[PDB]
Coordinates of C-alpha atoms in Angstrom, one line a residue:
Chain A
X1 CA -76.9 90.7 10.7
X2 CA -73.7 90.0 9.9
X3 CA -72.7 88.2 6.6
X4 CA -68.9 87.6 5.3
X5 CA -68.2 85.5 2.0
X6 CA -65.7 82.5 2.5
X7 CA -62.2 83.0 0.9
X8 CA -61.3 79.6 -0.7
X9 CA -57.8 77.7 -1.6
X10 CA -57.5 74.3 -3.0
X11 CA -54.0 73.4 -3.1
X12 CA -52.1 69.9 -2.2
X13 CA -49.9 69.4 0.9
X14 CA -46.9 69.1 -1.3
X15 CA -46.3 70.2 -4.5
X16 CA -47.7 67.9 -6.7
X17 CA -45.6 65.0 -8.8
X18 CA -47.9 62.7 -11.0
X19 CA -48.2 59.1 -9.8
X20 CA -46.6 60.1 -5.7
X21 CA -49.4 60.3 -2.9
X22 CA -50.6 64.1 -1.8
X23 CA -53.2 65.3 0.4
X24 CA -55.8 67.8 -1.6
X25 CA -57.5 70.6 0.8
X26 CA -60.2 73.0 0.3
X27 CA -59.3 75.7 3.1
X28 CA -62.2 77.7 3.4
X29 CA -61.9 81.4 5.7
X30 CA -63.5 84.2 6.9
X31 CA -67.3 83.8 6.6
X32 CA -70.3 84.1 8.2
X33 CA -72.4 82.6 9.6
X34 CA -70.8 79.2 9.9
X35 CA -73.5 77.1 7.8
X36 CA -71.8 75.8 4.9
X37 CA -71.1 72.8 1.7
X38 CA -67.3 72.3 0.8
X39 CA -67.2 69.3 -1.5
X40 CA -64.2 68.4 -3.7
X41 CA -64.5 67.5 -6.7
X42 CA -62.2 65.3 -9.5
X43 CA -63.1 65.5 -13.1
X44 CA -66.4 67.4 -12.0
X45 CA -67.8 64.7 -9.6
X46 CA -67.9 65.3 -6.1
X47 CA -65.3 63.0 -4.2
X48 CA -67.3 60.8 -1.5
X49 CA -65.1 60.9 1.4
X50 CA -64.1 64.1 2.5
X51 CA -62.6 64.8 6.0
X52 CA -62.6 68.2 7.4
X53 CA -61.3 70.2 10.7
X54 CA -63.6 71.2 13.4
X55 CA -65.1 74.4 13.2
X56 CA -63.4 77.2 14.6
X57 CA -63.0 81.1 13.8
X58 CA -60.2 83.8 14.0
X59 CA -59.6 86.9 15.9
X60 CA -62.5 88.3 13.9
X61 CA -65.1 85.9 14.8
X62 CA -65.1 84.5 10.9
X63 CA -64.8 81.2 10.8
X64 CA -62.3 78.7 8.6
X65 CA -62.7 74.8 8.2
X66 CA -60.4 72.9 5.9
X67 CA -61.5 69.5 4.1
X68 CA -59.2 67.2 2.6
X69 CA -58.5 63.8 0.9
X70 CA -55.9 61.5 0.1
X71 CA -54.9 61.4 -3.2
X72 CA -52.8 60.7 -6.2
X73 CA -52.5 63.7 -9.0
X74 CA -52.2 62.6 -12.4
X75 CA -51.7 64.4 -15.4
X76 CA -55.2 64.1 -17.0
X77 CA -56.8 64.4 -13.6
X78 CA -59.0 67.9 -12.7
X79 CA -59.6 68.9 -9.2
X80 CA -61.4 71.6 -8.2
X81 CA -63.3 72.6 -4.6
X82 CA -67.5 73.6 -4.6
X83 CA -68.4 76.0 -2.0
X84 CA -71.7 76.5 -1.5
X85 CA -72.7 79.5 1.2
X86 CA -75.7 82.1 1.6
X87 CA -73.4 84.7 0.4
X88 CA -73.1 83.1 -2.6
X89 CA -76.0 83.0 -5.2
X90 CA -74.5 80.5 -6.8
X91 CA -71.9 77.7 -5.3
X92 CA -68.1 78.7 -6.4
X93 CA -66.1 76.3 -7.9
X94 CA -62.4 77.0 -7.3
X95 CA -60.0 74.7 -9.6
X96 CA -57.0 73.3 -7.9
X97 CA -53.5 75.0 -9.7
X98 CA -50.2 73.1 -9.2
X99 CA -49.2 77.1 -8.6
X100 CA -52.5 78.8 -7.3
Chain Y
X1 CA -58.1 72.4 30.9
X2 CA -62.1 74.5 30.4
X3 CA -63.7 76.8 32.4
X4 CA -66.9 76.4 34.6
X5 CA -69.3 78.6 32.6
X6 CA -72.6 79.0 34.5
X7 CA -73.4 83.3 33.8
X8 CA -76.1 84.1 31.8
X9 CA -76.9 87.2 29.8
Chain S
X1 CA -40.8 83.0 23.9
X2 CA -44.3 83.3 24.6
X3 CA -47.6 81.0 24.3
X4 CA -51.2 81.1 24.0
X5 CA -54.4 78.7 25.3
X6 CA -57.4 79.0 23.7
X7 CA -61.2 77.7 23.9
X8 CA -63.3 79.2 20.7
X9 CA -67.5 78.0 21.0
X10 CA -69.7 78.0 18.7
X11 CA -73.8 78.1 19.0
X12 CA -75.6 77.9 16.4
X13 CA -79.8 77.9 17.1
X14 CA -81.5 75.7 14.5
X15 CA -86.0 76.7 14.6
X16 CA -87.9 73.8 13.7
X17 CA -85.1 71.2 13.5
X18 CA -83.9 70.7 17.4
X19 CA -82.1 72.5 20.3
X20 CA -79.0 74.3 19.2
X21 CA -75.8 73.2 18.1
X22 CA -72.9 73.6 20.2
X23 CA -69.3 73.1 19.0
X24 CA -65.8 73.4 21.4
X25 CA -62.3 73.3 20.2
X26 CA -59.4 73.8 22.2
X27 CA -56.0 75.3 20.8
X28 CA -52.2 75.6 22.6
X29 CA -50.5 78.3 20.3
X30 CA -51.7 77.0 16.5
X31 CA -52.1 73.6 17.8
X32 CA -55.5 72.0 17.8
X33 CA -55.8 69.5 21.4
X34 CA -59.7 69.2 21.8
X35 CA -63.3 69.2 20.4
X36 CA -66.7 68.6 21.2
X37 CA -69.6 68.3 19.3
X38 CA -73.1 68.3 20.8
X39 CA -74.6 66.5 17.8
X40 CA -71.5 63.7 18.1
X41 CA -72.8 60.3 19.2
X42 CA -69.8 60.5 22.2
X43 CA -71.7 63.5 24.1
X44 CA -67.5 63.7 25.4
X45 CA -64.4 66.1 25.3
X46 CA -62.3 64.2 22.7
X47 CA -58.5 64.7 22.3
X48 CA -57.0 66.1 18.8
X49 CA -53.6 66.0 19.6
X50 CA -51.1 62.8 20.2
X51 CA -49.8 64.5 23.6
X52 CA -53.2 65.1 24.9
X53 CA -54.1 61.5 25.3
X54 CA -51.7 61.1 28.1
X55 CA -54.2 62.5 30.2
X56 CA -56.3 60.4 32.7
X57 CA -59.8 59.3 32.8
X58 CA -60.3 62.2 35.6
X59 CA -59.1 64.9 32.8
X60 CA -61.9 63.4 30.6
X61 CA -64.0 63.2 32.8
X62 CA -64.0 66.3 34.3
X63 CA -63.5 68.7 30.8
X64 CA -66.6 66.6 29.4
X65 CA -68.6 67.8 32.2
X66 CA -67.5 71.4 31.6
X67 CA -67.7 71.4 28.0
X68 CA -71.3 70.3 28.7
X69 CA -72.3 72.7 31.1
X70 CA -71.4 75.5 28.5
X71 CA -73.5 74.2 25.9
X72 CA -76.3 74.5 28.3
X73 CA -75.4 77.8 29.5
X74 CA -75.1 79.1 25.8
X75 CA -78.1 77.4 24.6
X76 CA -79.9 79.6 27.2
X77 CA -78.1 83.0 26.2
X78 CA -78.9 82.3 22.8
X79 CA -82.6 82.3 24.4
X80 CA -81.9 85.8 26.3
X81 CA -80.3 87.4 23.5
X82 CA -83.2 87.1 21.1
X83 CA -85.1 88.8 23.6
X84 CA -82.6 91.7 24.2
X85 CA -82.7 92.2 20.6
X86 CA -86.0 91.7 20.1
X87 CA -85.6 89.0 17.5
X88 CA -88.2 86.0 15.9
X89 CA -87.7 82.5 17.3
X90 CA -88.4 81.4 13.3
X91 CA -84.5 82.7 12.5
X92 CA -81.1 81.1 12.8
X93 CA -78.3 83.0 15.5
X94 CA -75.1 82.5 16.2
X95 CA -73.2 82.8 19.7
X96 CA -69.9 82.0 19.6
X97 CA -67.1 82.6 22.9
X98 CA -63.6 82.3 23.3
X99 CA -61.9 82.6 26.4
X100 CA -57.9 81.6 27.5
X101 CA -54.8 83.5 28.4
X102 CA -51.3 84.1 27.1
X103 CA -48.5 83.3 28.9
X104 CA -45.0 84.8 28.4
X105 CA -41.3 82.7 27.8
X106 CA -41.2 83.3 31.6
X107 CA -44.3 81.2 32.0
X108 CA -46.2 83.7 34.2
X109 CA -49.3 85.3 33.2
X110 CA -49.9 87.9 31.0
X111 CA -53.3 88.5 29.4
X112 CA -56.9 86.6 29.9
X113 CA -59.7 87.0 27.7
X114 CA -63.4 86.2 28.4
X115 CA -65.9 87.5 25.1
X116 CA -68.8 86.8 23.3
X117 CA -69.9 87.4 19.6
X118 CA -73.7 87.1 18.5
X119 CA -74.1 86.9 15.1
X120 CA -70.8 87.8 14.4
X121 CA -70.6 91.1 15.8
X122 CA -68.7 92.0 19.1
X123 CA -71.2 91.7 22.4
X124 CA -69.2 92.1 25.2
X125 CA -65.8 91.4 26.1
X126 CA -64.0 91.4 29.7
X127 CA -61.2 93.9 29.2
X128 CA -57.1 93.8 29.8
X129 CA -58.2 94.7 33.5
X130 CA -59.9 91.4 34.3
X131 CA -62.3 94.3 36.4
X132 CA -64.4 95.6 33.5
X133 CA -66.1 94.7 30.4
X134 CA -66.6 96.3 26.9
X135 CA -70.4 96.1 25.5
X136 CA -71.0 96.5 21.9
X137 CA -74.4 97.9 21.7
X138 CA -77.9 98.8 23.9
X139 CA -78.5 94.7 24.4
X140 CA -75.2 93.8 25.5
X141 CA -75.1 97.1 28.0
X142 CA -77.8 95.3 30.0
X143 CA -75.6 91.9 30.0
X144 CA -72.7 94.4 31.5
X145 CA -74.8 96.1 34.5
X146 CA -76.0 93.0 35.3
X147 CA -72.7 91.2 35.3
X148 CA -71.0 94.7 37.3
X149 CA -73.6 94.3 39.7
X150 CA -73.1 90.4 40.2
X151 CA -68.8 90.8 39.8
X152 CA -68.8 88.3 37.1
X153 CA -65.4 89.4 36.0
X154 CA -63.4 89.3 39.6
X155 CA -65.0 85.6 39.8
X156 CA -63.3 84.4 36.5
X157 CA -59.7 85.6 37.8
X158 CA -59.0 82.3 39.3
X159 CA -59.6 80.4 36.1
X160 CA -57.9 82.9 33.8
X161 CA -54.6 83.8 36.1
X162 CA -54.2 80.4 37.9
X163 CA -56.2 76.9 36.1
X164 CA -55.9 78.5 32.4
X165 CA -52.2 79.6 33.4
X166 CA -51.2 76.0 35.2
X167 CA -53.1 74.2 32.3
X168 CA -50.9 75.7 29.7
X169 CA -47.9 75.2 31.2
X170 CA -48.6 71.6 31.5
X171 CA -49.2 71.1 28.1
X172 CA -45.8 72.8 26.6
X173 CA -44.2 70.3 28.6
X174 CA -45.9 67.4 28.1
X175 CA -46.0 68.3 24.1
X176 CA -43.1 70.0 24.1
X177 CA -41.4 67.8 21.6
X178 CA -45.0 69.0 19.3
X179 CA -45.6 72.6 21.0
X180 CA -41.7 73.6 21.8
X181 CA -40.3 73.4 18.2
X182 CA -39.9 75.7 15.5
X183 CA -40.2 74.6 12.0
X184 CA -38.5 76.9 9.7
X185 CA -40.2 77.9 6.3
X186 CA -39.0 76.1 3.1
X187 CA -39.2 78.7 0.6
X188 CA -38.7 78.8 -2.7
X189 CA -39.8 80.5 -6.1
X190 CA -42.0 80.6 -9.2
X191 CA -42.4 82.3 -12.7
X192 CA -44.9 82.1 -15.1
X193 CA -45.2 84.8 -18.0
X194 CA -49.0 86.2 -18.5
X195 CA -47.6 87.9 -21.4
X196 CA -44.5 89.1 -23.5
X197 CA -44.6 92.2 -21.3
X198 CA -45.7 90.9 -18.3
X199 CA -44.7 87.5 -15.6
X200 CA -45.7 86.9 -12.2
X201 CA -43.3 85.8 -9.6
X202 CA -44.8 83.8 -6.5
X203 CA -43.0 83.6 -2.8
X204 CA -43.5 80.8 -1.1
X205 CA -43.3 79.2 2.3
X206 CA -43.8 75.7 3.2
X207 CA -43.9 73.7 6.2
X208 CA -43.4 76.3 8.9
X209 CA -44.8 76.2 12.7
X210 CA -45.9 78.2 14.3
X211 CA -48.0 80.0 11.9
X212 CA -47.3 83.6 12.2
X213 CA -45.1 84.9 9.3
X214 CA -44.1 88.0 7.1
X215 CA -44.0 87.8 2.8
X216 CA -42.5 91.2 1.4
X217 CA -42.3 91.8 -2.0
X218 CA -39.6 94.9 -2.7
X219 CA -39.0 96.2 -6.1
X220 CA -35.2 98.0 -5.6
X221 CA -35.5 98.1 -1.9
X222 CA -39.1 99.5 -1.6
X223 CA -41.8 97.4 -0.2
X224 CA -44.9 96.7 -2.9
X225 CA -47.3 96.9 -0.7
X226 CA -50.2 97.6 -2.8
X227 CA -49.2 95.4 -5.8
X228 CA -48.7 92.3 -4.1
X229 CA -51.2 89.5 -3.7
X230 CA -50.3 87.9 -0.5
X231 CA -52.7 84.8 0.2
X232 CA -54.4 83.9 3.9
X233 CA -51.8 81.3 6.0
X234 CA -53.8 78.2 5.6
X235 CA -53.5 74.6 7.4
X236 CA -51.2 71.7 5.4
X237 CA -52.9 69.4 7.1
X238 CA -49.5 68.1 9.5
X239 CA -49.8 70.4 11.9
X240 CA -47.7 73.0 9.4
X241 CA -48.5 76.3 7.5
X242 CA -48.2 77.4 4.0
X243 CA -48.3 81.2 2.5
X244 CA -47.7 83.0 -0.8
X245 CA -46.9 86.2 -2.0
X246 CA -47.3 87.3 -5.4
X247 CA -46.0 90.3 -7.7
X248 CA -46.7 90.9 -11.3
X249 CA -43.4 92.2 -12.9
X250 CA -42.7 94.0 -16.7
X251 CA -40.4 90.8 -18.5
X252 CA -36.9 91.4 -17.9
X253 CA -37.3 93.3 -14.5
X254 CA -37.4 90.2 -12.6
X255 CA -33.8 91.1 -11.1
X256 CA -35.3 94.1 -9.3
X257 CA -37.6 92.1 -7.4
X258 CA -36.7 90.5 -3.6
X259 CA -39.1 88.2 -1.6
X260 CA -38.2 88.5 2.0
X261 CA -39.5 86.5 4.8
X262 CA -39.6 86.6 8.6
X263 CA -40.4 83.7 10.9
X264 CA -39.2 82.8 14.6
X265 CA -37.5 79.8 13.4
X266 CA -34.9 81.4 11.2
X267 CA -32.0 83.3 12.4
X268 CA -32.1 85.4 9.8
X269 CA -34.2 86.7 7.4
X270 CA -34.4 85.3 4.2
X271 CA -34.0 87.3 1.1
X272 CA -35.2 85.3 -2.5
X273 CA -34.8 86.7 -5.9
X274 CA -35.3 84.8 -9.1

């Protein structure tokens, strides 16, 4: 059976600027199979509501699925994206960079 | 606009 | 110049908690236009993009009862290829399809595609042809004989060089303000020392449709291939793309380094250096 582990980005819309409305995404990529936990999460608690894309899957058959909120970035503010998968023995937490 | 898929394996 | 339709399925068996679920999404080029969801409460086709909803009740109608009948005829192949493979019915498997056809700037047809994946691997494809079809293993060989003997593949011709064709072209046009355009990237650059020998410069694009693009890093005209980090294209969220490209550079040698980009929406090339 096959079994790929998700590449994860969490990165805004727009490059960020403290106190101006932004979208934060969790673009997750490439895994298998397509049972999976993205949550978001600001100052280490998970953000309660979360949108995200249909699934789908690329040329590879891996599938991607991005979720995202609305939000406001302020300096003191820490955003970060949990991915929790069955390649993973323990969920990855992926903190959001202004840069990547 | 879908396809009519009715063929099984 | 040329444009792409695209259903991609997913079904996804579930022992012990229900029948399978089944999940469509429809795509013009990188443009999401449809879903369904056989958990949803609607049981219908839904539209995911603004131009979409111009279609009538009939269009609904009629690519609800479709959509449906896949998820019926995948539910059952799920069924048949845990047989072939001689699998457990306490496990979890995964059949996923996509199907469509590319179209060139002429409009006219130029490839179809008919395949299946189970559990992520290749099981049989319908080939360039539109005649023949490409098995993966032993299970999926039976699937092919039968489906030779039956002409499964000069049955699906109508859909895939006229219906899938005709669709498509109704769609550019009716979203052609949407599907039509190009967005060029916005690039621009960063640079953050990691050291006092070392800095990384970062490419980026922002805001480009559709999503196919090139990042090269060159260091004095040669390409860096295998020192760049170059990130997956991923979704803004508005229907645009974003990528990066990184390099790691010894302090001071910034000036040897050139980001260049290619995408259809700019007549020329970019070249960046910081």
């Amino acid at each position: 059976m096959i079994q790929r582990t998700p590449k994860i980005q969490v990165y805004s819309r727009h490059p960020a600027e403290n106190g101006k409305s932004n979208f934060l995404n969790c673009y997750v990529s490439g895994f298998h199979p397509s049972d999976i936990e993205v949550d978001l999460l600001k100052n280490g608690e998970r953000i309660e509501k979360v949108e995200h894309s249909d699934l789908s899957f690329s040329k590879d058959w891996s599938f991607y699925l991005l979720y995202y909120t609305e939000f406001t970035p302020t300096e003191k503010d820490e955003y970060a994206c949990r991915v929790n998968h069955v390649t993973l023995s323990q969920p990855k937490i992926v903190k959001w960079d202004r840069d990547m | 606009n879908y396809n009519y898929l009715y063929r099984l394996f | 110049g040329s444009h792409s339709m695209r259903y991609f399925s997913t079904s996804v068996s579930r022992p012990g908690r229900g029948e399978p679920r089944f999940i469509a999404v429809g795509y013009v080029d990188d443009t999401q236009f449809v879903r369904f969801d056989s958990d949803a409460a609607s049981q219908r086709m839904e539209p995911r993009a603004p131009w979409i909803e111009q279609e009538g009740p009939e269009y609904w109608d009629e690519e609800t009862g479709k959509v449906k009948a896949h998820s019926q005829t995948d539910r059952e192949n799920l069924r048949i290829a845990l047989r072939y493979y001689n699998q457990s019915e306490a496990g979890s498997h995964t059949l996923q399809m996509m199907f469509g056809c590319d179209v060139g700037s002429d409009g006219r047809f130029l490839r179809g595609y008919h395949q299946y994946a189970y559990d992520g691997k290749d099981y049989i494809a319908l080939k360039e042809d539109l005649r023949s079809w490409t098995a993966a293993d032993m299970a999926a060989q039976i699937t092919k004989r039968k489906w030779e003997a039956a002409h499964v593949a000069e049955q699906q011709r109508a859909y895939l060089e006229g219906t899938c064709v005709d669709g498509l072209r109704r769609y550019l046009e009716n979203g052609k303000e949407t599907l039509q355009r190009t967005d060029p990237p916005k690039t621009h650059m960063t640079h953050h020392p990691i050291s006092d020998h070392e800095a990384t410069l970062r490419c980026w694009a922002l805001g480009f449709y559709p999503a196919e693009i090139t990042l090269t890093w060159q260091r004095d005209g040669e390409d860096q291939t295998q020192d760049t980090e170059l990130v997956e294209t991923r979704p803004a969220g508005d229907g645009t793309f974003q990528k990066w490209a990184a390099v790691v550079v010894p302090s001071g040698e910034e000036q040897r380094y050139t980001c260049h980009v290619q995408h259809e929406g700019l007549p020329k090339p970019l070249t960046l250096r910081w």
